[PDB]
């Protein structure tokens, strides 16, 4: 084995699995998903004695069931339900990489409302809703509302988080530290406008979000991480095992 030496020993046999996923979305004003997909990777961190033969099992039939469009593995994976079998490197390594497009959980729904007021004002109401278990918290949420180029100033009201009008970036950035599943939040903004060439209307860019959630948007669930070392005297159940899911936004846009 070229990726794992042979005399490794640990008194505390332990492994940590990380399911890191980026969820991407393009949503129309009318609520139709124009496009969506998840890119994920499973990173393993293992401190296991010997030369352990592990078995990684997730919800892959294709309750819980998820379809994987494609995927790639780490050389230690012995290709041929049908699950993954390997003798892992020590420390941290990427066990697998995959893509999903079906039955994706969109953690956030963005509902924008724009009203034009003569030529001097723009009235914007943006509502965000968390689509996930209430016991789970999202963190690092940011909602970004683009403002026209002829913006003389912006007034915003948001009961949750903090918001800042950023003239340089031509946008209103609303930041929220945490937000539990199944909740709603809104921001209101009055965009004061300057005079401009009338003919050239404004091509309204999408409202976009940034967030981090503790579950895999693709629906992936680790079922087991079986450890077997034929020689040494530690069995599967002696191993201390942890899993962590960190699903984050990629391009997550809502057309207004």
């Amino acid at each position: 084995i070229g990726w794992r030496r042979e005399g490794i020993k640990y008194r505390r046999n332990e492994l940590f699995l990380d399911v890191l996923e980026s969820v991407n979305l393009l949503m129309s004003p009318q609520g139709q998903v124009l496009s969506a997909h998840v890119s994920g990777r499973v990173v393993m961190k293992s401190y296991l004695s010997g030369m352990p033969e592990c078995k990684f099992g997730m919800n892959d039939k294709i309750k819980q069931s998820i379809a994987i469009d494609d995927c790639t593995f780490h050389q230690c994976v012995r290709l041929s339900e049908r699950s993954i079998s390997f003798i892992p490197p020590d420390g941290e390594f990427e066990l697998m990489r995959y893509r999903t497009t079906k039955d994706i959980i969109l953690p956030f729904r963005v509902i924008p409302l724009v009203r034009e007021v003569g030529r001097t004002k723009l009235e914007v109401k943006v509502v965000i809703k968390s689509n996930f278990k209430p016991s789970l918290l999202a963190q690092k949420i940011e909602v970004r509302i683009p403002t026209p180029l002829n913006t003389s100033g912006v007034q915003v009201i948001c009961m949750k988080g903090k918001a800042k009008y950023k003239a340089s970036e031509n946008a209103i950035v609303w930041k929220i530290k945490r937000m539990a599943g199944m909740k709603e939040s809104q921001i209101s903004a009055e965009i004061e406008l300057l005079p401009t060439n009338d003919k050239k209307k404004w091509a309204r860019p999408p409202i976009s979000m940034n967030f981090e959630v503790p579950f895999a948007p693709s629906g992936l669930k680790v079922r087991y991480l079986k450890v077997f070392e034929p020689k040494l005297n530690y069995s599967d159940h002696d191993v201390i095992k942890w899993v962590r899911y960190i699903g984050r936004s990629g391009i997550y846009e809502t057309r207004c």
Binding site: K241, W242, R244
Partner: peptide, 6 residues
């Protein structure tokens, strides 16, 4: 956060 895997 990390969760135990049975």
């Amino acid at each position: 956060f990390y969760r135990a895997l049975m």
